[PDB]
Amino acid sequence: LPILQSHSALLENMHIEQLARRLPARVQGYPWRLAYSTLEHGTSLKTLYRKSASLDSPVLLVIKDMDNQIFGAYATHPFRFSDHYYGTGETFLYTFSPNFKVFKWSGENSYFINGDISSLELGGGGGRFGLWLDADLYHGRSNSCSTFNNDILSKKEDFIVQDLEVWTFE
Amino acid sequence: RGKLIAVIGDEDTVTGFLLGGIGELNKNRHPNFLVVEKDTTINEIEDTFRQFLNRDDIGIILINQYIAEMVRHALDAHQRSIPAVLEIPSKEHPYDAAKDSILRRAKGMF
Amino acid sequence: VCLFLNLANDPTIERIITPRLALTTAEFLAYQCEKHVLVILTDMSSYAEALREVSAAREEVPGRRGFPGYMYTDLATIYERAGRVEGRNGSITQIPILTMPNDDITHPIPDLTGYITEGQIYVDRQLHNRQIYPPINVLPSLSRLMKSAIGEGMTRKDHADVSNQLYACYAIGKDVQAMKAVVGEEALTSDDLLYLEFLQKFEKNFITQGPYENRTVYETLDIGWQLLRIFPKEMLKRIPQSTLSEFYPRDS
Amino acid sequence: NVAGVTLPVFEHYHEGEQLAKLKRNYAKAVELLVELASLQTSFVTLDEAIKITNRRVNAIEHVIIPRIERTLAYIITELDEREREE
């Protein structure tokens, strides 16, 4: 019943079980491949976009902060540099806090994913982001945004990435 | 606009590359192909090959290798990169092997 | 701090006396009061200008390049008032500071100083023009005694490995940065693009520091690991597997 | 472009069943030939630029640098003479 992965490091089986119940029909019954990991490939946003640039299927983002909280997003499109917001309403944010919560689209706006040379972010609605990351994958921020109506995904609004992974279904 | 491709061949690979849509005849009514019929004089397959080689409208020249070989003199003497001469294979005469005028640049390497 | 000031229009004999008062004080503080003394001697190039003048006043003939022929034995009498000694818990460490004409290392003052002292720290006009401070260039710089100062019980066990790997990455980064202008950035490999990212972040975070910002060696080594973590750990060939296992991963 | 050398290349553009099969089977041949002439116009142009570059690397190593070193050795020798005269 639990899914097949080609390796793993931030997720234990109880995280795999609870995520795999929620992923869309698009990606049910596919093995998970590790596209990027800070622990395998070194730590930078330019490396994350470089490893993602060949992809053409959805991705799961997993983050562990320095307070050990696990959170991230499921995103309908790979993380790429974009002039404007992109993605579709099957995108969601999630956290284990320590109980698993998932914040699917509110229907209010389509500000799902935005990538820049110096940051990656998800959500919108004023100055808010459900998840923002710096060029180093060192500082990030999470606050409630009206795209997802999310909680704070970390233990704090402002956080340090301990480590980060991007998985693709392929 | 753009260049043409030109063809210097046995009659069957001038029906090939012509049922392929290559090649015109210009406003001066100069053609774009040569047909090496069996009694062709050896000069002819140079006389037109030099005309193609220094026209402006020809981008590629396609030559069946056995009649590049009849002019191996004039053909290896082309040092420029402007019209590219492809030594294609033929029918019953054996296919493209060694002896190609361009591959020879890599003498210690191919 | 004990401070001795000799100004540009003080007597030129007071400039000859100044290093000798300073070192006679450091010898009392180190070898009688058992302190570790740091001695900073500022423009040994200004000292040599006064030495050449006292030499001319004695009516001596000018030596090689216009300085006194005995200028090695004179500078060595200043610089060898240094060290640790048996049975006393103090020491004297010297940092001479020198200005070179034409940025030329082959002039008598830096050249004779190189035969007596054991290393150099090199201050660079290009880093200064690029608005970096302190503009210290680590590629021509060397401390010849560094292996005796660093490691377990003296700094941290990884210090030698981090120092070797940061030097090796910077020496490659400057070479990739040169070929980028020849081959263009689309011909660079993924590993060249990692050295090109390290090069920028090394100069902005490790070398660039505030004039009132103080980093312990532990903070310096931690800033060193933040930069080494740009690379896959297979790239870090100057660092042994035991050091990579203890220090490459982040922790809460 | 390759290291600042510009290479010429070519781009193809286009203006009963046995005859249709023949039209396919020849049209797919001119798609090799217009590719292969892009490789041969590149190759013959790239061979020239390597020779010109290797000749400059040799001239700097064998002709230009030694003339500078002989000049620089003469200057040091003449400055020792002026010092000994003085």
From Swiss-Prot, chain B:
Pfam families for the chain: ATP-synt_F (PF01990)
Domain of life: Eukaryota
Keywords, sorted A to Z: Cytoplasmic vesicle, Hydrogen ion transport, Ion transport, Membrane, Synapse, Transport
Record-level Gene Ontology MF annotations: proton-transporting ATPase activity, rotational mechanism
Major localisation: membrane
SUPFAM superfamilies: AtpF-like
UniProt membrane topology term: Peripheral membrane protein
One biological process term in Gene Ontology: synaptic vesicle lumen acidification
Subcellular location: Cytoplasmic vesicle, Secretory vesicle, Synaptic vesicle membrane; Cytoplasmic vesicle, Clathrin-coated vesicle membrane
Expression across tissues: Expressed in brain (at protein level).
InterPro entries for the chain: ATPase_V1-cplx_f_g_su, ATPase_V1-cplx_fsu_euk, ATPase_V1_fsu_sf
A cellular component annotation (GO) from this entry: clathrin-coated vesicle membrane
PANTHER family (alphabetical): V-TYPE PROTON ATPASE SUBUNIT F, VACUOLAR ATP SYNTHASE SUBUNIT F
Protein function: Subunit of the V1 complex of vacuolar(H+)-ATPase (V-ATPase), a multisubunit enzyme composed of a peripheral complex (V1) that hydrolyzes ATP and a membrane integral complex (V0) that translocates protons. V-ATPase is responsible for acidifying and maintaining the pH of intracellular compartments and in some cell types, is targeted to the plasma membrane, where it is responsible for acidifying the extracellular environment.
Complexes and interactors: V-ATPase is a heteromultimeric enzyme made up of two complexes: the ATP-hydrolytic V1 complex and the proton translocation V0 complex. The V1 complex consists of three catalytic AB heterodimers that form a heterohexamer, three peripheral stalks each consisting of EG heterodimers, one central rotor including subunits D and F, and the regulatory subunits C and H. The proton translocation complex V0 consists of the proton transport subunit a, a ring of proteolipid subunits c9c'', rotary subunit d, subunits e and f, and the accessory subunits ATP6AP1/Ac45 and ATP6AP2/PRR.
NCBIfam families xrefs: V_ATP_synt_F
Family stated for the protein in its record: Belongs to the V-ATPase F subunit family.
Protein known as: V-type proton ATPase subunit F
Lineage: Eukaryota, Metazoa, Chordata, Craniata, Vertebrata
Curated annotation (Swiss-Prot), chain C:
Tissue: Expressed in brain (at protein level).
Subcellular location: Apical cell membrane; Melanosome; Cytoplasm; Cytoplasmic vesicle, Secretory vesicle, Synaptic vesicle membrane
Entry GO terms, CC: apical plasma membrane; clathrin-coated vesicle membrane; cytoplasm; cytosol; extrinsic component of synaptic vesicle membrane; melanosome; microvillus; plasma membrane
Highest rank taxon of the organism: Eukaryota
Disulfide bond residue pairs: none
Binding site for ATP: R144
Keywords: ATP-binding, Cell membrane, Cytoplasm, Cytoplasmic vesicle, Hydrogen ion transport, Ion transport, Membrane, Nucleotide-binding, Synapse, Transport
GO molecular function annotation: ATP binding; proton-transporting ATPase activity, rotational mechanism
Function text: Non-catalytic subunit of the V1 complex of vacuolar(H+)-ATPase (V-ATPase), a multisubunit enzyme composed of a peripheral complex (V1) that hydrolyzes ATP and a membrane integral complex (V0) that translocates protons. V-ATPase is responsible for acidifying and maintaining the pH of intracellular compartments and in some cell types, is targeted to the plasma membrane, where it is responsible for acidifying the extracellular environment.
Family designation: Belongs to the ATPase alpha/beta chains family.
Protein name in UniProt: V-type proton ATPase subunit B, brain isoform
Species assigned in the record: Rattus norvegicus (Rat)
Lineage: Eukaryota, Metazoa, Chordata, Craniata, Vertebrata
Interval of the full protein contained in this chain: 257 to 508 of 511
